[PDB]
Design a protein around this motif. Sequence first.
Motif, short mmCIF file in Angstrom:
data_model
loop_
_atom_site.label_atom_id
_atom_site.label_comp_id
_atom_site.label_asym_id
_atom_site.label_seq_id
_atom_site.Cartn_x
_atom_site.Cartn_y
_atom_site.Cartn_z
N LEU A 87 1.24 11.54 -40.78
CA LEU A 87 2.17 11.70 -39.69
C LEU A 87 1.39 12.04 -38.46
CD1 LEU A 87 5.08 11.57 -39.02
CD2 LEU A 87 5.37 13.87 -39.95
N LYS A 88 0.39 12.88 -38.58
CA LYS A 88 -0.44 13.19 -37.44
C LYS A 88 -1.07 11.96 -36.88
CE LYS A 88 -4.26 16.14 -36.00
NZ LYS A 88 -5.32 15.13 -35.75
N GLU A 89 -1.81 11.25 -37.71
CA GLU A 89 -2.38 9.99 -37.22
C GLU A 89 -1.29 9.03 -36.72
OE1 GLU A 89 -5.22 7.87 -39.38
OE2 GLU A 89 -6.61 9.59 -39.56
N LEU A 90 -0.20 8.87 -37.48
CA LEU A 90 0.89 8.01 -37.03
C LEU A 90 1.44 8.47 -35.70
CD1 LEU A 90 3.04 6.91 -40.00
CD2 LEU A 90 1.71 5.51 -38.41
N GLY A 119 1.75 6.71 -32.01
CA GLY A 119 2.96 6.54 -31.25
C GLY A 119 3.65 5.23 -31.60
N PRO A 120 4.68 4.87 -30.84
CA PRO A 120 5.30 5.60 -29.73
C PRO A 120 6.06 6.83 -30.20
CG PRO A 120 6.68 3.79 -30.34
CD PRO A 120 5.44 3.65 -31.16
N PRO A 121 5.93 7.93 -29.47
CA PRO A 121 6.56 9.18 -29.93
C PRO A 121 8.08 9.11 -29.96
CG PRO A 121 5.17 9.53 -27.95
CD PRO A 121 5.28 8.05 -28.16
N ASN A 122 8.71 8.29 -29.10
CA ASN A 122 10.17 8.20 -29.13
C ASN A 122 10.68 7.45 -30.36
OD1 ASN A 122 9.52 5.54 -28.53
ND2 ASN A 122 10.99 5.35 -26.84
N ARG A 156 5.93 -6.62 -39.46
CA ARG A 156 5.07 -6.90 -40.61
C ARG A 156 3.70 -7.37 -40.16
NH1 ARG A 156 5.72 -12.10 -43.91
NH2 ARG A 156 5.70 -12.41 -41.64
N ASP A 157 3.65 -8.24 -39.16
CA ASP A 157 2.39 -8.88 -38.82
C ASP A 157 1.54 -8.00 -37.91
OD1 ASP A 157 2.83 -11.16 -40.35
OD2 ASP A 157 4.18 -12.00 -38.82
N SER A 158 2.13 -7.47 -36.84
CA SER A 158 1.33 -6.73 -35.87
C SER A 158 1.03 -5.30 -36.32
CB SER A 158 2.05 -6.73 -34.51
OG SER A 158 3.02 -5.70 -34.41
N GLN A 159 1.80 -4.76 -37.26
CA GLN A 159 1.71 -3.39 -37.75
C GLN A 159 2.02 -2.34 -36.69
OE1 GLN A 159 -1.93 -2.81 -40.21
NE2 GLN A 159 -1.95 -5.05 -40.42
N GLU A 160 2.62 -2.73 -35.56
CA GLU A 160 3.13 -1.74 -34.62
C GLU A 160 4.25 -0.90 -35.25
OE1 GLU A 160 5.34 -3.67 -31.64
OE2 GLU A 160 6.08 -1.87 -30.63
N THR A 161 4.25 0.39 -34.93
CA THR A 161 5.25 1.31 -35.46
C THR A 161 6.58 1.11 -34.72
OG1 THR A 161 3.62 2.95 -36.19
CG2 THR A 161 5.84 3.77 -35.61
N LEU A 162 7.65 0.83 -35.48
CA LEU A 162 8.99 0.69 -34.92
C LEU A 162 9.86 1.91 -35.12
CD1 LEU A 162 9.65 -2.86 -36.27
CD2 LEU A 162 8.59 -2.14 -34.11
N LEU A 163 9.76 2.57 -36.27
CA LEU A 163 10.65 3.68 -36.60
C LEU A 163 9.98 4.50 -37.69
CD1 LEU A 163 13.27 4.73 -35.52
CD2 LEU A 163 14.52 3.52 -37.31
N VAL A 164 9.87 5.80 -37.47
CA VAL A 164 9.39 6.72 -38.49
C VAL A 164 10.47 7.78 -38.69
CG1 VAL A 164 7.65 8.40 -39.13
CG2 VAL A 164 6.99 6.33 -37.96
N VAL A 195 20.33 15.14 -37.88
CA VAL A 195 19.22 14.41 -37.29
C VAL A 195 18.51 15.27 -36.25
CG1 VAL A 195 18.51 12.31 -36.13
CG2 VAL A 195 20.47 12.30 -37.68
N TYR A 196 17.18 15.21 -36.24
CA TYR A 196 16.38 15.87 -35.23
C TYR A 196 15.36 14.87 -34.73
CZ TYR A 196 18.08 19.94 -37.97
OH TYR A 196 18.85 20.83 -38.69
N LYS A 197 14.90 15.08 -33.50
CA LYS A 197 13.83 14.29 -32.91
C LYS A 197 12.54 15.07 -33.07
CE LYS A 197 11.97 10.86 -30.55
NZ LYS A 197 10.57 11.14 -31.10
N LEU A 198 11.49 14.41 -33.54
CA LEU A 198 10.19 15.05 -33.70
C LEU A 198 9.40 14.95 -32.40
CD1 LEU A 198 8.68 14.09 -37.16
CD2 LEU A 198 9.84 16.18 -36.60
N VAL A 199 8.91 16.09 -31.91
CA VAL A 199 8.18 16.14 -30.65
C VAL A 199 6.78 16.71 -30.91
CG1 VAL A 199 10.23 16.29 -29.20
CG2 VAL A 199 9.18 18.38 -30.10
#
Length: 217
Positions: free
Chosen positions: A66-69, A73-76, A185-193, A211-215
């Motif tokens: 999670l730290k590395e993730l 980012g993106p943090p939002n 799948r292809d680019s491995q960009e983070t969409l939702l964690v 639900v909470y937002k992680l900051v």
Amino acid sequence: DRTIASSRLRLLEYSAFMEVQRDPDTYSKHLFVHIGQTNPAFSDPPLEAVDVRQIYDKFPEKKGGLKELYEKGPPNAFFLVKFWADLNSTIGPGAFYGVSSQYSSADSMTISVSTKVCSFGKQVVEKVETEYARLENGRFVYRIHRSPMCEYMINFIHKLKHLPEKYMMNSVLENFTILQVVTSRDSQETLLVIAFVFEVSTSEHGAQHHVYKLVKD
Ligand SMILES: CCC(=O)N1CCc2ccc(-c3ccc(C(F)(F)F)cc3)cc2C1
């Protein structure tokens, strides 16, 4: 927006359940955990923030961490959902244990979903699912229907169900977590964690969630 969403991907519904067939035409379904499609209301309070560093130790460290993730980012896109599980099933061999979910998006993509079951911050199991866009109503949706649960979790639920007391159940769950990571799948960009922490519904009221937002300060 009170929604579990990023700029690229929104989780609409999430459901972990067991289904049993009572007779050839009749089926019963008990939901353990649930998130339902809601429409944001203008009057809805903003999501509370949880410092991402306080839950680092609940999920695995370093790569895929999670730290590395969160560093990538993106943090939002990083959320924490607390689940109150419904372990009261009035419902044998042959029951189906599944998870169904929907996402939505303004862009069409091929998403890959990674789900890591975690015990005492150590990964017990990863499942990886690929899902495809479909055009509905001004967005694309991604539908995962009845993705089978793996045995680790079927055994977990059963054995957890077998504990005499709801307080003991919660103690076990205190060190049980699930980390979901959705990439393109292809680019491995983070969409939702989403990080998933759990508690037994002591109410006997049906399962709930928050639900909470992680900051990161
Ligand atoms: C490895 C992937 C996999 O098997 N998954 C991932 C998705 C997912 C989410 C939540 C639950 C769950 C069910 C019941 C309880 C309860 F026992 F506390 F009620 C707690 C959690 C099970 C699963 C199944």
